[PDB]
Amino acid sequence: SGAIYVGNYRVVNRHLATHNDWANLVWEDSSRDLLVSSTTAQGCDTIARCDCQTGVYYCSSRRKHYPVSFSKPSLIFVEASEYYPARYQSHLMLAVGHSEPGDCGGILRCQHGVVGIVSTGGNGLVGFADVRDLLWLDE
Ligand SMILES: COc1ccncc1CC(=O)N1CCC[C@H](C(N)=O)C1
Numbered sequence: 345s346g347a348i349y350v351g352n353y354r355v356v357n358r359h360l361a362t363h364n365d366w367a368n369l370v371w372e373d374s375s376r377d378l379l380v381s382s383t384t385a386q387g388c389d390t391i392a393r394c395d396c397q398t399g400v401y402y403c404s405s406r407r408k409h410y411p412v413s414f415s416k417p418s419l420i421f422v423e424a425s426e427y428y429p430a431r432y433q434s435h436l437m438l439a440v441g442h443s444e445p446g447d448c449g450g451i452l453r454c455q456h457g458v459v460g461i462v463s464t465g466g467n468g469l470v471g472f473a474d475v476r477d478l479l480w481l482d483e
């Protein structure tokens with residue numbers, strides 16, 4: 345679990361969105377595993393606007409933060425699950441690092457702010473859904 349709170353938006357994994365998230369839907373994209381819903385309180389997370397390839401992510405299955413080098417956002421094959429058939433997920437960045445399914449939502453951050461959230465993993469790899477291109481999150 346885990347979300348990004350910026351301004352009047354809440355950003356979560358689309359496969360983990362609640363009824364409230366869908367009833368207050370702003371934008372969703374199955375191909376990116378992202379859903380953004382509206383909120384009444386103001387969020388103070390800063391979204392990074394950069395091309396950083398190093399950062400730190402929170403791993404709930406270990407109650408620890410880990411530093412990682414990660415790839416540039418791209419289309420990566422993701423195996424079938426109870427939420428999606430086997431497909432290419434776009435805007436996905438991989439790193440070598442521990443992750444388990446319940447780790448989705450954990451934030452990835454660089455010196456500039458929030459980069460994205462855990463969305464995929466397996467075999468010593470962890471994948472993060474990028475949010476740095478969603479410029480509208482700030483206005
Ligand atoms: C962080 O998740 C994992 C880590 C290790 N083994 C497994 C996982 C789980 C995983 O990869 N998923 C399941 C839920 C939907 C995901 C998606 N974006 O399509 C894919």
Ligand SMILES: [Zn+2]
Pocket residue numbers: 392393394395396454455456457
């Ligand atoms: Zn950065």
